[PDB]
RNA sequence: GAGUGGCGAACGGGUGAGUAACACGUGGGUGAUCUGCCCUGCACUUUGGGAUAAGCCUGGGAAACGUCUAAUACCGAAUACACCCUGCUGGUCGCAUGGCCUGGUAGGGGAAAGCUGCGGUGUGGGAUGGGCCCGCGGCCUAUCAGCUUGUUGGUGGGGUGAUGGCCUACCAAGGCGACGACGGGUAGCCGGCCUGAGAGGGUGACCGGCCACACUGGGACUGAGAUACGGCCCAGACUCCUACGGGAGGCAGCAGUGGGGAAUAUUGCACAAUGGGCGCAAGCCUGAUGCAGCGACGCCGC
């Protein structure tokens, strides 16, 4: 399931307020609600701030990296690139947007794919809103 | 049926009639001992112990009676003979 | 009587065995007396065995099964027990 | 070369019990009452429980109201699992 | 090919009827006991005989179940000092019967198999599996208050692998119960699994232990081991074949079929892999098992 401007238009930033920040956080990264539920339940298991771990897990996604990398414009543009398998990780075809890259992960591009290989130094802290989404659940 | 059960039925007729014969022969040996003891007949009963205790432990050597059973018979006959 | 087996603990098309001492009577994934070692989906097969416990159970008279007897002959606990001059030195990983 | 014989190569303890004698009227068997105390799993009262335990006397030494030390056995008879070791106090 | 013979067939797999019990779960005990196969000490594998299937000829019927010849089949003996039984006696250990030192004695007895490298009897030890007792633990009910006579104990015998009223014959008059005996109802038990912050409450699917049962009941035989699923005998209930004289069979194995249900699968492929049985081995069996099909039934991922 992939969702496939207005959905953003309702929220702005293009229980009343609680759901709206989750909604942009979900439809920004292109996640389905069941997958977003899983990253929360992993985040609260991990130590530190439970809200701050959530944004670390969502930023770790391999397609998110492409968006930040800027190899492909529009996070939704990178969905078309990644699943098609243009990208490579440690000499392996990742055809998966849900791949979460760790530290020392080498993302290269496949030969051809003609329409620049940046590396992960660590999983970025929040400095590189969560307390609504934490208080939404539980 | 259908199986090699048909063969192992034929064995259990054969091997029963062997073990039935030996088990029955021990009973008549042990029975005739006690009638000698209850008469007050010492010299006859002393002979019949060595007759029976021979025959008991041979049946253990067959693999019929099992030696612990054969031993506990011989114990009972000897303690009877002493009195 | 007692026998050194393998027991298939893996998921589908991906077996992992652990080298188990057990009775001949028991079902394949049943109760072991002792788990000695472990062991095929690799360029180099992964084989690990306690050398001390293998000598104990073989010294008692635990009969190895046919494919375990290969693994003992490879790692060289069979040649310690048997006392024949082929010795030991095999495996690696990478 | 081998020796024609090998060594066999000990002795776990049976349980003990002490308790006051009741009804020593049956052919050398003494019916001893053993007190036990356990905390009740929920409520946490220490309940005093009891049970009658048929001990083998042999010769009829002890009497009623005596505090007799015991030890376990095989079944000497069905119910009878015990024997007296030593007789403390008297009636 | 079939036939005698040796091992296997008690394992694997199924289902939850029964059972409120030493059945189960955790603890111990066994001076109260068994153990084929396996290995690893020691000592031997001596000597003779008698039969019986197969094969031929008879009867019986649609069907199916009188005379000959071999063996690691079955049997008289001899030898065995380990071993079993009894008598007299030594020392030590202690938890009472008693154990142990192969204690030492002197009486009486115990076995076997051979043919093209595998075996065979006896007896020490080790390992496996069991069996039998007990401590405590775990559902509802007094609109169930008395129950018991082999009942509780003793002595002499029988019996079992083994201790025991386990059984049996005589004396004693005891046992269990308000801490729920004897009854009625429901129930496989557990590691776990769902929930809850916990303590609790519910449930016992898959996966892994132990129990019970194999149309319904009652037996025993063979064996190292039997609730003996695909064994035997008898009695009952039910259903098939029949040329009406006679027979045969039990999916709670895997598929499958019809019912009942709101509802649950293919009359699949293969012994390649792991486990098991037999054989010296090559191998030969394995609906265990490894896989495939089918159903969004569930959990993930695109
Ligand atoms: Mg006796
Ligand atoms: Mg009841
Ligand atoms: Mg046998
Ligand atoms: Mg029921
Ligand atoms: Mg609460
Ligand atoms: Mg029946
Ligand atoms: Mg028998
Ligand atoms: Mg069947
Ligand atoms: Mg059978
Ligand atoms: Mg079926």
Short mmCIF file of N, CA, C and O in Angstrom, two decimals, chain B:
data_model
loop_
_atom_site.label_atom_id
_atom_site.label_comp_id
_atom_site.label_asym_id
_atom_site.label_seq_id
_atom_site.Cartn_x
_atom_site.Cartn_y
_atom_site.Cartn_z
N UNK B 1 -5.62 -57.85 8.82
CA UNK B 1 -4.27 -58.48 8.97
C UNK B 1 -3.33 -58.08 7.81
O UNK B 1 -2.74 -57.01 7.86
N UNK B 2 -3.19 -58.94 6.80
CA UNK B 2 -2.31 -58.72 5.63
C UNK B 2 -0.79 -58.81 5.91
O UNK B 2 -0.02 -59.17 5.01
N UNK B 3 -0.35 -58.53 7.14
CA UNK B 3 1.07 -58.26 7.44
C UNK B 3 1.83 -59.57 7.70
O UNK B 3 1.29 -60.66 7.50
N UNK B 4 3.09 -59.45 8.14
CA UNK B 4 3.82 -60.56 8.78
C UNK B 4 3.30 -60.98 10.18
O UNK B 4 3.90 -61.85 10.81
N UNK B 5 2.22 -60.37 10.65
CA UNK B 5 1.41 -60.89 11.77
C UNK B 5 0.99 -62.36 11.60
O UNK B 5 0.96 -63.11 12.58
N UNK B 6 0.66 -62.75 10.37
CA UNK B 6 0.29 -64.14 10.05
C UNK B 6 1.41 -65.14 10.40
O UNK B 6 1.13 -66.24 10.87
N UNK B 7 2.66 -64.73 10.20
CA UNK B 7 3.82 -65.50 10.65
C UNK B 7 3.98 -65.51 12.17
O UNK B 7 4.25 -66.56 12.75
N UNK B 8 3.82 -64.35 12.81
CA UNK B 8 4.01 -64.23 14.26
C UNK B 8 2.85 -64.78 15.10
O UNK B 8 3.01 -64.96 16.31
N UNK B 9 1.69 -65.03 14.49
CA UNK B 9 0.65 -65.87 15.10
C UNK B 9 1.09 -67.34 15.16
O UNK B 9 0.84 -68.02 16.16
N UNK B 10 1.72 -67.83 14.09
CA UNK B 10 2.20 -69.23 14.03
C UNK B 10 3.30 -69.52 15.05
O UNK B 10 3.39 -70.64 15.55
N UNK B 11 4.14 -68.52 15.33
CA UNK B 11 5.17 -68.63 16.37
C UNK B 11 4.59 -68.68 17.78
O UNK B 11 5.06 -69.46 18.61
N UNK B 12 3.58 -67.85 18.05
CA UNK B 12 2.99 -67.76 19.40
C UNK B 12 2.10 -68.94 19.79
O UNK B 12 1.75 -69.08 20.96
N UNK B 13 1.72 -69.78 18.82
CA UNK B 13 1.23 -71.14 19.11
C UNK B 13 2.36 -72.10 19.46
O UNK B 13 2.25 -72.87 20.42
N UNK B 14 3.44 -72.06 18.68
CA UNK B 14 4.62 -72.91 18.89
C UNK B 14 5.29 -72.63 20.24
O UNK B 14 5.56 -73.56 21.00
N UNK B 15 5.55 -71.36 20.52
CA UNK B 15 6.38 -70.95 21.65
C UNK B 15 5.61 -70.91 22.98
O UNK B 15 6.23 -70.93 24.05
N UNK B 16 4.28 -70.85 22.91
CA UNK B 16 3.42 -71.08 24.08
C UNK B 16 3.51 -72.53 24.57
O UNK B 16 3.69 -72.77 25.77
N UNK B 17 3.38 -73.48 23.65
CA UNK B 17 3.36 -74.91 23.99
C UNK B 17 4.69 -75.43 24.56
O UNK B 17 4.70 -76.43 25.29
N UNK B 18 5.79 -74.76 24.23
CA UNK B 18 7.07 -74.97 24.89
C UNK B 18 7.06 -74.48 26.34
O UNK B 18 7.42 -75.22 27.26
N UNK B 19 6.63 -73.23 26.54
CA UNK B 19 6.67 -72.58 27.86
C UNK B 19 5.58 -73.08 28.81
O UNK B 19 5.79 -73.13 30.02
N UNK B 20 4.42 -73.43 28.26
CA UNK B 20 3.35 -74.11 29.01
C UNK B 20 3.80 -75.46 29.56
O UNK B 20 3.46 -75.82 30.69
N UNK B 21 4.57 -76.20 28.76
CA UNK B 21 5.11 -77.51 29.16
C UNK B 21 6.10 -77.42 30.33
O UNK B 21 6.04 -78.23 31.25
N UNK B 22 6.99 -76.43 30.27
CA UNK B 22 8.04 -76.26 31.29
C UNK B 22 7.46 -75.68 32.59
O UNK B 22 7.83 -76.13 33.68
N UNK B 23 6.57 -74.70 32.48
CA UNK B 23 5.87 -74.13 33.65
C UNK B 23 5.02 -75.16 34.40
O UNK B 23 4.98 -75.14 35.64
N UNK B 24 4.35 -76.05 33.66
CA UNK B 24 3.56 -77.13 34.25
C UNK B 24 4.43 -78.21 34.92
O UNK B 24 4.05 -78.73 35.98
N UNK B 25 5.57 -78.53 34.31
CA UNK B 25 6.51 -79.51 34.88
C UNK B 25 7.14 -79.05 36.20
O UNK B 25 7.43 -79.88 37.07
N UNK B 26 7.36 -77.74 36.35
CA UNK B 26 7.80 -77.16 37.62
C UNK B 26 6.74 -77.26 38.73
O UNK B 26 7.10 -77.45 39.89
N UNK B 27 5.47 -77.12 38.37
CA UNK B 27 4.38 -77.18 39.35
C UNK B 27 4.25 -78.57 39.97
O UNK B 27 4.17 -78.69 41.19
N UNK B 28 4.26 -79.61 39.13
CA UNK B 28 4.21 -81.00 39.61
C UNK B 28 5.45 -81.42 40.41
O UNK B 28 5.34 -82.25 41.31
N UNK B 29 6.60 -80.85 40.08
CA UNK B 29 7.83 -81.04 40.86
C UNK B 29 7.74 -80.39 42.24
O UNK B 29 8.07 -81.02 43.25
N UNK B 30 7.29 -79.13 42.28
CA UNK B 30 7.11 -78.39 43.54
C UNK B 30 5.94 -78.95 44.36
O UNK B 30 5.99 -78.93 45.59
N UNK B 31 4.90 -79.45 43.69
CA UNK B 31 3.74 -80.06 44.37
C UNK B 31 4.11 -81.36 45.09
O UNK B 31 3.75 -81.55 46.25
N UNK B 32 4.83 -82.24 44.40
CA UNK B 32 5.30 -83.50 44.97
C UNK B 32 6.33 -83.38 46.08
O UNK B 32 6.49 -84.30 46.89
N UNK B 33 7.04 -82.25 46.12
CA UNK B 33 7.90 -81.89 47.25
C UNK B 33 7.11 -81.69 48.55
O UNK B 33 7.50 -82.19 49.60
N UNK B 34 6.01 -80.94 48.47
CA UNK B 34 5.28 -80.50 49.66
C UNK B 34 4.55 -81.66 50.35
O UNK B 34 4.46 -81.69 51.58
N UNK B 35 4.03 -82.60 49.56
CA UNK B 35 3.44 -83.84 50.08
C UNK B 35 4.45 -84.74 50.80
O UNK B 35 4.07 -85.46 51.73
N UNK B 36 5.71 -84.71 50.37
CA UNK B 36 6.80 -85.39 51.08
C UNK B 36 7.13 -84.73 52.43
O UNK B 36 7.43 -85.43 53.40
N UNK B 37 7.09 -83.40 52.47
CA UNK B 37 7.35 -82.64 53.71
C UNK B 37 6.20 -82.80 54.72
O UNK B 37 6.46 -82.99 55.91
N UNK B 38 4.96 -82.71 54.24
CA UNK B 38 3.78 -82.82 55.11
C UNK B 38 3.52 -84.23 55.67
O UNK B 38 2.81 -84.38 56.66
N UNK B 39 4.10 -85.25 55.03
CA UNK B 39 4.13 -86.61 55.59
C UNK B 39 5.05 -86.76 56.81
O UNK B 39 4.85 -87.67 57.63
N UNK B 40 6.06 -85.89 56.94
CA UNK B 40 7.16 -86.08 57.88
C UNK B 40 8.20 -87.05 57.35
O UNK B 40 8.71 -87.89 58.10
N UNK B 41 8.52 -86.93 56.06
CA UNK B 41 9.43 -87.83 55.36
C UNK B 41 10.68 -87.05 54.95
O UNK B 41 10.66 -86.31 53.96
N UNK B 42 11.75 -87.21 55.72
CA UNK B 42 12.92 -86.33 55.63
C UNK B 42 13.85 -86.75 54.49
O UNK B 42 14.24 -85.92 53.67
N UNK B 43 14.20 -88.04 54.46
CA UNK B 43 15.15 -88.57 53.47
C UNK B 43 14.64 -88.52 52.02
O UNK B 43 15.43 -88.37 51.09
N UNK B 44 13.32 -88.66 51.84
CA UNK B 44 12.69 -88.49 50.53
C UNK B 44 12.63 -87.02 50.11
O UNK B 44 12.94 -86.68 48.97
N UNK B 45 12.23 -86.15 51.05
CA UNK B 45 12.11 -84.71 50.78
C UNK B 45 13.46 -84.02 50.55
O UNK B 45 13.54 -83.08 49.75
N UNK B 46 14.50 -84.47 51.25
CA UNK B 46 15.87 -83.99 51.02
C UNK B 46 16.39 -84.30 49.61
O UNK B 46 17.13 -83.49 49.03
N UNK B 47 16.01 -85.45 49.07
CA UNK B 47 16.29 -85.80 47.67
C UNK B 47 15.50 -84.94 46.68
O UNK B 47 16.05 -84.51 45.67
N UNK B 48 14.22 -84.71 46.98
CA UNK B 48 13.33 -83.95 46.08
C UNK B 48 13.67 -82.46 45.96
O UNK B 48 13.28 -81.83 44.97
N UNK B 49 14.39 -81.90 46.94
CA UNK B 49 14.91 -80.53 46.83
C UNK B 49 15.96 -80.41 45.72
O UNK B 49 15.88 -79.50 44.89
N UNK B 50 16.92 -81.32 45.72
CA UNK B 50 17.97 -81.36 44.69
C UNK B 50 17.44 -81.79 43.31
O UNK B 50 18.05 -81.48 42.29
N UNK B 51 16.32 -82.51 43.29
CA UNK B 51 15.55 -82.74 42.06
C UNK B 51 14.91 -81.46 41.52
O UNK B 51 15.02 -81.15 40.33
N UNK B 52 14.22 -80.72 42.40
CA UNK B 52 13.45 -79.54 42.00
C UNK B 52 14.32 -78.31 41.74
O UNK B 52 14.10 -77.59 40.77
N UNK B 53 15.30 -78.07 42.62
CA UNK B 53 16.19 -76.91 42.51
C UNK B 53 17.11 -76.96 41.29
O UNK B 53 17.49 -75.92 40.74
N UNK B 54 17.49 -78.17 40.88
CA UNK B 54 18.01 -78.43 39.53
C UNK B 54 17.05 -77.95 38.45
O UNK B 54 17.42 -77.16 37.58
N UNK B 55 15.81 -78.43 38.52
CA UNK B 55 14.80 -78.19 37.47
C UNK B 55 14.33 -76.73 37.38
O UNK B 55 14.00 -76.26 36.29
N UNK B 56 14.29 -76.03 38.51
CA UNK B 56 13.94 -74.60 38.55
C UNK B 56 14.93 -73.74 37.76
O UNK B 56 14.52 -72.95 36.91
N UNK B 57 16.22 -73.89 38.06
CA UNK B 57 17.26 -73.02 37.51
C UNK B 57 17.60 -73.35 36.05
O UNK B 57 18.12 -72.50 35.33
N UNK B 58 17.31 -74.58 35.62
CA UNK B 58 17.30 -74.93 34.19
C UNK B 58 16.21 -74.20 33.39
O UNK B 58 16.44 -73.82 32.24
N UNK B 59 15.04 -74.02 33.99
CA UNK B 59 13.96 -73.23 33.38
C UNK B 59 14.27 -71.73 33.31
O UNK B 59 13.78 -71.04 32.41
N UNK B 60 15.06 -71.23 34.25
CA UNK B 60 15.65 -69.89 34.16
C UNK B 60 16.68 -69.76 33.03
O UNK B 60 16.76 -68.72 32.38
N UNK B 61 17.46 -70.82 32.82
CA UNK B 61 18.42 -70.88 31.71
C UNK B 61 17.76 -70.94 30.32
O UNK B 61 18.37 -70.52 29.33
N UNK B 62 16.55 -71.48 30.24
CA UNK B 62 15.74 -71.43 29.01
C UNK B 62 15.34 -70.00 28.61
O UNK B 62 15.24 -69.69 27.42
N UNK B 63 15.13 -69.14 29.61
CA UNK B 63 14.53 -67.81 29.41
C UNK B 63 13.02 -67.80 29.54
O UNK B 63 12.36 -66.96 28.93
N UNK B 64 12.48 -68.72 30.34
CA UNK B 64 11.03 -68.85 30.54
C UNK B 64 10.64 -68.13 31.83
O UNK B 64 9.88 -67.16 31.80
N UNK B 65 11.18 -68.61 32.95
CA UNK B 65 10.70 -68.22 34.29
C UNK B 65 11.34 -66.94 34.84
O UNK B 65 10.75 -66.30 35.72
N UNK B 66 12.53 -66.58 34.35
CA UNK B 66 13.34 -65.43 34.82
C UNK B 66 14.00 -65.70 36.19
O UNK B 66 13.32 -66.15 37.12
N UNK B 67 15.32 -65.41 36.33
CA UNK B 67 16.11 -66.03 37.42
C UNK B 67 15.70 -65.63 38.84
O UNK B 67 15.82 -66.45 39.76
N UNK B 68 15.25 -64.39 39.03
CA UNK B 68 14.73 -63.92 40.33
C UNK B 68 13.53 -64.73 40.84
O UNK B 68 13.42 -64.97 42.04
N UNK B 69 12.64 -65.13 39.93
CA UNK B 69 11.55 -66.06 40.26
C UNK B 69 12.09 -67.44 40.61
O UNK B 69 11.67 -68.04 41.61
N UNK B 70 13.02 -67.95 39.80
CA UNK B 70 13.66 -69.25 40.05
C UNK B 70 14.42 -69.31 41.37
O UNK B 70 14.43 -70.35 42.03
N UNK B 71 15.05 -68.21 41.76
CA UNK B 71 15.77 -68.11 43.04
C UNK B 71 14.83 -68.14 44.24
O UNK B 71 15.07 -68.87 45.20
N UNK B 72 13.76 -67.35 44.18
CA UNK B 72 12.79 -67.25 45.28
C UNK B 72 11.94 -68.51 45.50
O UNK B 72 11.35 -68.67 46.58
N UNK B 73 11.86 -69.38 44.50
CA UNK B 73 11.32 -70.73 44.69
C UNK B 73 12.28 -71.60 45.49
O UNK B 73 11.89 -72.21 46.48
N UNK B 74 13.55 -71.65 45.05
CA UNK B 74 14.60 -72.43 45.73
C UNK B 74 14.82 -72.03 47.19
O UNK B 74 15.12 -72.88 48.03
N UNK B 75 14.70 -70.73 47.48
CA UNK B 75 14.73 -70.22 48.86
C UNK B 75 13.58 -70.78 49.72
O UNK B 75 13.80 -71.15 50.87
N UNK B 76 12.38 -70.81 49.15
CA UNK B 76 11.19 -71.30 49.85
C UNK B 76 11.23 -72.81 50.14
O UNK B 76 10.74 -73.25 51.18
N UNK B 77 11.80 -73.59 49.22
CA UNK B 77 11.91 -75.04 49.38
C UNK B 77 12.96 -75.44 50.43
O UNK B 77 12.74 -76.38 51.19
N UNK B 78 14.08 -74.73 50.46
CA UNK B 78 15.18 -75.03 51.38
C UNK B 78 14.86 -74.68 52.84
O UNK B 78 15.19 -75.45 53.74
N UNK B 79 14.21 -73.54 53.05
CA UNK B 79 13.73 -73.14 54.38
C UNK B 79 12.59 -74.03 54.90
O UNK B 79 12.43 -74.20 56.11
N UNK B 80 11.79 -74.58 53.98
CA UNK B 80 10.81 -75.63 54.31
C UNK B 80 11.48 -76.96 54.70
O UNK B 80 11.02 -77.62 55.63
N UNK B 81 12.53 -77.33 53.98
CA UNK B 81 13.25 -78.59 54.23
C UNK B 81 13.99 -78.63 55.57
O UNK B 81 14.05 -79.68 56.21
N UNK B 82 14.55 -77.49 55.98
CA UNK B 82 15.33 -77.41 57.23
C UNK B 82 14.51 -77.72 58.48
O UNK B 82 15.01 -78.37 59.40
N UNK B 83 13.26 -77.26 58.50
CA UNK B 83 12.30 -77.65 59.53
C UNK B 83 11.69 -79.02 59.21
O UNK B 83 10.90 -79.55 59.99
#
